[PDB]
């Protein structure tokens, strides 16, 4: 019934704000609509497991907030393998490299990945982290896809594919579906290309031990009965002096303050009163989350090591199933496997099929790209279709179609209110990530406690400490990535020659 | 609390799908949100308006089960005037013209805007109204915004600015929000660009006597305490014999079968049990509805006609807050009035401003347009801010952004077990219109009638007789208009 704060979904950053607000002798209270906390996190454990993320499970360097939250709660990091050659599957064929770079050798190509990698790079800088519809062309890059500023930019097919890749792994959406300046703006927003993509050194680096279902179920244990699972919200209203919260099982909660800490969609299972103002109103129907199949196939050694394999795997094109992999073998060396994602319209195309199915066309096309028959002798199979969940909507995240965030992206985090909104997809480092949903949780918890007197204006936001277990390198170029042309730059070079 | 089957929102498709299964008798509920029933239609009364449509208003030729759907609910119609000269207003100048397409003089700009509406024609002939989704070219289509199919198309400015405002009329989104294929297919749907864009003898023709409102109204009339006001349905529970549906104040509804009349995307304000299919859970996160606000300025007299102008203005261009304006007054020359539209983008910018700013800019804007001191002198202003409706989602409908329609499209209207799908968006001919509203219902209904064994599959999609108030005269072309090049046809040929 009575408290200070109602956060409104117990994924990470729904518990990341309850925990702080807890922490400072406020009252709160978690209305979470499933019957477990984690949300877009969640960590399956069985016999034949032992342990396995089928949500959210990658951390890495420039992740502070994650690292020390789940520091503070107990857990520990173990490095992604990464020992081996990765493999750039192009064409049918398979070629072993090594650096977060998939390379060519073709001089015209390399000068085209190049430069559209740095070009990636160049435009996020003019794109601010808190306020990406004021770059100065938001309005030009936010009325074009992804799919069209790859058609300007790719001068080969090469740059292209892998671009497209590039893509649909980092949002699960595909190149067409989505704003080119959003695109720029999310990148930019984790570092940029080479942070983004990397395992070393990158986003991919580690994952928890034991999961990272841990961080959201530690906290709900020092939370003790404050957390109130089955509890969907259905109804807020904000015509009296306390805000009223209403769940579908017909409890009525009392409050001061709410946090939204659900992905913005979401909101459109809530009916308010009074109705939400006419932009976050238009704005909750036009946030889409991406389409992902994550699958684990376990088998009984990390044969693929021994091949000198890392066990990761850049899949282009459209045939293959899965585009991305990634050795998900525990740090013991033990319950070898590789996890894949199902991408964007395959994880749509290939929902049709039964698991058993997804399992032989995922061992057929490892076998193919390891070139390895042990590959097709898997001894167990896991996976998770994240576009079936009602309370998430997808994975991993919220995109924006063409238009949108220049038009409704300033009132993503405007409170309404008494309501102020957590969720990863209002964080500015590591939007659509678990350090995100931390950001975003912490900072909602913090705008509450400057309403109430409690903290000053600038205590809203507040940086964090960089982890002393996961140092960040900096992220570096050469002169020659810096400065040479692009291929329109090579002809236009050749043209003034030939004059 | 128990009943045959469960009708979720009083719009004219609820209320049109609820007469329906009324009708062969059958104990329906309408389940509706609001405390009021119309939906997207509003008629609001007063002494100053009378009446006056502040959401759906015209019904046209072609649009034969609104017309019987209202006729047989004593409704009559009126032609909305366009007896004087059309206005095209280009570069801050008004050049008056007769015919439904804004013409043009140049010999380059002719064949370009030629090209341009006959290429949205072209494209459409080979879209299923039924399923867009299986055009030959659907992927490529579908993939590709309305901006970059223009920008492909018009060759100048002039087509491109026009071409711009067509889409944003049609469809109240800005062409790099929407799909190419949606949108030649929405245009398709409709009979075509003729057809979409007249007024007489196409979509515009007509208005309510006394206002739309009156249809669902009047329905509501017939079915009396079966229509249930301030009922939002929170939950739907298909897990046992009989569907139970809730409502936010607390009711329980238990039926045999529920039909959804409600805008896609607001289905995501309902909590399912088991949870919804993964494609339909996805696709009412993907289709948004469009932004618009509706103004009406009235003035003591028509004084527009007395210039030889019928009211109609089709006004180019970034800084005018209205792009379209259709003659709003009766059909006794009375309650003089000029509807327009603030479109898409501008719905949002303008919507900061009080509403005696918006009516100053329109005034203003008049003035200029149609070259009259006059329009400075208001009598009386109405409008309404559909972006603001939390039962809505926006107005006129749901558009479709690049990639979905493909991918969701088949999802529409598939039923999910004893839930069938009505709604003006699944309809296929004039759907986002009170027409489609009413195709669809019925089509919902038969569904349900079918399912129960009371009538054959193929009485589901039922044909509807011409009216004969309102007959349709055909869409033609001239030779030159079919034959004349494109201009890089012509640059081909030099
Ligand atoms: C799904 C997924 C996500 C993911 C990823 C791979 C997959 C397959 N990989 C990631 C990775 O390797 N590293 C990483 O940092 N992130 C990765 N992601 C994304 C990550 O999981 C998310 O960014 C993060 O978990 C989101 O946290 P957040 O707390 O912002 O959001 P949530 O987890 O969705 O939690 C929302 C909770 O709210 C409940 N809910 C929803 N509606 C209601 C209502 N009406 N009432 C009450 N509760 C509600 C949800 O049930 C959920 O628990
Ligand atoms: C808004 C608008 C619409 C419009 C237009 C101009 C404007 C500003 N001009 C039109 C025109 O000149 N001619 C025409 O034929 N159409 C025009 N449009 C579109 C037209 O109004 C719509 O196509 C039509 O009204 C749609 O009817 P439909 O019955 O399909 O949909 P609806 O009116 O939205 O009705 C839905 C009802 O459902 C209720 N609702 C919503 N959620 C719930 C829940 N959860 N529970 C119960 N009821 C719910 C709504 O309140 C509504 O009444
Ligand atoms: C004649 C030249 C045609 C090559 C087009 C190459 N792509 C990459 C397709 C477009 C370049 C765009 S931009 O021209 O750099 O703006
Ligand atoms: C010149 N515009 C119309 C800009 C492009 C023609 C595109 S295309 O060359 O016909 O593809
Ligand atoms: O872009 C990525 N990786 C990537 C790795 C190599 C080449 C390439 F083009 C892309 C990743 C982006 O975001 C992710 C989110 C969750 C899990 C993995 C990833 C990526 O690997
Ligand atoms: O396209 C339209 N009209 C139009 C009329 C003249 C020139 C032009 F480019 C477009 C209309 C489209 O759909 C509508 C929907 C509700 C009300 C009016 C209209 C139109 O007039």
Same mark, same amino acid.
């Given at each position: 019934?009575?408290?200070? /704060?109602?956060?409104?979904?117990?994924?990470?950053?729904?518990?990341?704000?309850?925990?702080?607000?807890?922490?400072?002798?406020?009252?709160?209270?978690?209305? *979470?609509?499933?019957?477990?906390?984690? =949300?877009?996190?969640?960590?399956?454990?069985?016999?034949?497991?032992?342990?396995?993320?089928?949500?959210?499970?990658?951390? @890495?360097?420039?992740?502070?907030?994650?690292?020390?939250?789940?520091?503070?709660?107990?857990?520990?990091?173990?490095?992604?393998?990464?020992?081996?050659?990765?493999?750039?599957?192009?064409? =049918?064929?398979?070629?072993?490299?090594?650096?977060?770079?998939?390379?060519?050798?073709?001089?015209?190509?390399?000068?085209? %990945?190049?430069?559209?990698?740095?070009?990636?790079?160049?435009?996020?800088?003019?794109?601010?982290?808190? &306020?990406?519809?004021?770059?100065?062309?938001?309005?030009?890059?936010?009325?074009?896809?992804?799919?069209?500023?790859?058609?300007?930019?790719?001068?080969?097919?090469?740059?292209?594919?892998?671009?497209?890749?590039?893509?649909?792994?980092?949002?699960? &959406?595909?190149?067409?579906?989505?704003?080119?300046?959003?695109?720029?703006?999310?990148?930019?927003?984790?570092?940029?290309? $080479?942070?983004?993509?990397?395992?070393?050194?990158?986003?991919?680096?580690?994952?928890?031990?034991?999961?990272?279902?841990?961080?959201?179920?530690?906290?709900?244990?020092?939370?003790?009965?404050?957390?109130?699972?089955?509890?969907?919200?259905?109804?807020?209203?904000?015509?009296?002096?306390?805000?009223?919260?209403?769940?579908?099982? %017909?409890?009525?909660?009392?409050?001061?303050?709410?946090?939204? &800490? +659900?992905?913005?969609? !979401?909101?459109? #299972?809530?009916?308010?009163?009074?109705?939400?103002?006419?932009?976050?109103?238009?704005?909750?129907?036009?946030?889409?989350?991406?389409?992902?199949? #994550?699958?684990?196939?376990?088998?009984?050694?990390?044969?693929?090591?021994?091949?000198?394999?890392?066990?990761?795997?850049?899949?282009?094109?459209?045939?293959?199933?899965?585009?991305?992999?990634?050795?998900?073998? #525990?740090?013991?060396?033990?319950?070898?496997?590789?996890?894949?994602?199902?991408?964007?319209?395959?994880?749509?195309?290939?929902?049709?099929?039964?698991?058993? *199915?997804?399992?032989?066309?995922?061992?057929?096309?490892?076998?193919? /790209?390891?070139?390895?028959? *042990?590959?097709?002798?898997?001894?167990?199979?896991?996976?998770?279709?994240?576009?079936?969940?009602?309370?998430?909507?997808?994975?991993?995240?919220?995109?924006?179609?063409?238009?949108?965030?220049?038009?409704?992206?300033?009132?993503?985090?405007?409170?309404?209110?008494?309501?102020?909104?957590?969720?990863?997809? $209002?964080? $500015?480092?590591?939007?659509?990530?678990?350090? =995100? &949903?931390?950001?975003? @949780?912490?900072?909602?918890?913090?705008?509450?406690?400057?309403?109430?007197?409690?903290?000053?204006?600038?205590?809203?936001?507040?940086?964090?400490?960089?982890?002393?277990?996961?140092?960040?390198?900096?992220?570096?170029? $050469?002169? !020659?990535?810096?400065?040479?042309?692009?291929?329109? @730059? !090579?002809?236009?070079? +050749?043209?003034?020659?030939? +004059?």
């Amino acid at each position: 019934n009575k408290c200070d /704060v109602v956060v409104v979904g117990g994924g990470i950053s729904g518990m990341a704000a309850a925990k702080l607000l807890h922490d400072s002798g406020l009252n709160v209270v978690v209305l *979470e609509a499933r019957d477990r906390v984690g =949300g877009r996190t969640y960590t399956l454990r069985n016999q034949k497991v032992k342990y396995v993320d089928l949500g959210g499970s990658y951390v @890495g360097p420039t992740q502070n907030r994650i690292l020390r939250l789940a520091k503070e709660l107990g857990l520990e990091t173990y490095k992604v393998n990464e020992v081996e050659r990765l493999i750039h599957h192009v064409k =049918g064929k398979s070629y072993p490299f090594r650096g977060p770079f998939p390379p060519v050798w073709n001089p015209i190509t390399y000068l085209d %990945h190049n430069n559209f990698w740095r070009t990636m790079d160049d435009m996020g800088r003019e794109i601010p982290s808190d &306020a990406p519809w004021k770059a100065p062309l938001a309005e030009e890059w936010d009325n074009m896809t992804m799919k069209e500023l790859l058609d300007k930019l790719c001068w080969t097919e090469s740059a292209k594919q892998l671009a497209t890749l590039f893509v649909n792994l980092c949002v699960t &959406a595909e190149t067409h579906e989505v704003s080119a300046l959003w695109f720029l703006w999310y990148v930019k927003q984790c570092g940029g290309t $080479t942070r983004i993509i990397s395992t070393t050194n990158g986003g991919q680096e580690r994952k928890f031990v034991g999961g990272s279902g841990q961080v959201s179920e530690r906290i709900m244990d020092l939370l003790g009965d404050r957390v109130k699972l089955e509890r969907p919200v259905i109804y807020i209203d904000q015509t009296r002096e306390n805000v009223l919260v209403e769940t579908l099982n %017909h409890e009525m909660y009392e409050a001061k303050y709410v946090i939204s &800490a +659900i992905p913005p969609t !979401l909101g459109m #299972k809530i009916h308010f009163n009074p109705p939400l103002p006419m932009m976050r109103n238009q704005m909750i129907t036009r946030v889409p989350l991406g389409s992902v199949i #994550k699958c684990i196939v376990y088998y009984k050694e990390p044969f693929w090591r021994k091949k000198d394999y890392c066990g990761t795997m850049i899949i282009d094109g459209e045939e293959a199933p899965v585009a991305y992999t990634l050795d998900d073998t #525990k740090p013991e060396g033990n319950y070898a496997a590789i996890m894949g994602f199902i991408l964007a319209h395959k994880a749509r195309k290939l929902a049709r099929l039964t698991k058993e *199915e997804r399992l032989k066309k995922l061992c057929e096309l490892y076998a193919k /790209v390891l070139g390895s028959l *042990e590959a097709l002798e898997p001894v167990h199979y896991e996976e998770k279709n994240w576009c079936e969940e009602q309370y998430s909507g997808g994975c991993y995240t919220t995109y924006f179609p063409p238009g949108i965030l220049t038009q409704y992206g300033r009132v993503l985090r405007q409170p309404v209110d008494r309501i102020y909104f957590a969720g990863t997809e $209002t964080a $500015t480092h590591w939007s659509g990530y678990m350090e =995100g &949903a931390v950001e975003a @949780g912490e900072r909602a918890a913090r705008e509450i406690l400057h309403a109430m007197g409690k903290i000053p204006e600038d205590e809203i936001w507040q940086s964090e400490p960089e982890s002393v277990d996961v140092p960040a390198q900096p992220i570096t170029t $050469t002169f !020659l990535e810096r400065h040479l042309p692009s291929v329109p @730059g !090579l002809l236009r070079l +050749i043209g003034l020659t030939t +004059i």
